Amino acid sequence: SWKRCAGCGGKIADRFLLYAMDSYWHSRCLKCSSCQAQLGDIGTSSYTKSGMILCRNDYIRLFGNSGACSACGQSIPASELVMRAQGNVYHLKCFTCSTCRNRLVPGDRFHYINGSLFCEHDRPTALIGDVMVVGEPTLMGGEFGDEDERLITRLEN
Residues engaged in binding Zn ion (CB under 5 A): 5, 7-8, 26, 29, 32, 34-35, 37, 55, 58, 69, 71-72, 91, 94, 97, 99-100, 119, 122
CB of 16 to Zn ion, least distance (A): 13
Q: 94 or 134, CB closer to Zn ion?
A: 94
d(CA 65, CA 58): 12
CB of 89 to Zn ion, least distance (A): 9
CB of 73 to Zn ion, least distance (A): 7
Burial code (b: 16+ CB inside 10 Å, e: under 16) for 53-72 equals: bbbbbbbbbebbeebebbbe
Q: 58 or 142, CB closer to Zn ion?
A: 58
Burial code (b: 16+ CB inside 10 Å, e: under 16) for 25-42 equals: bbbebbbbbeeebbbbee
Q: 116 or 142, CB closer to Zn ion?
A: 116
CB of 147 to Zn ion, least distance (A): 18
Measured in whole angstroms, how far is the alpha carbon of residue 59 from the centre of its chain?
9
62 φ/ψ angles, rounded to the nearest 5 degrees: -85, -25
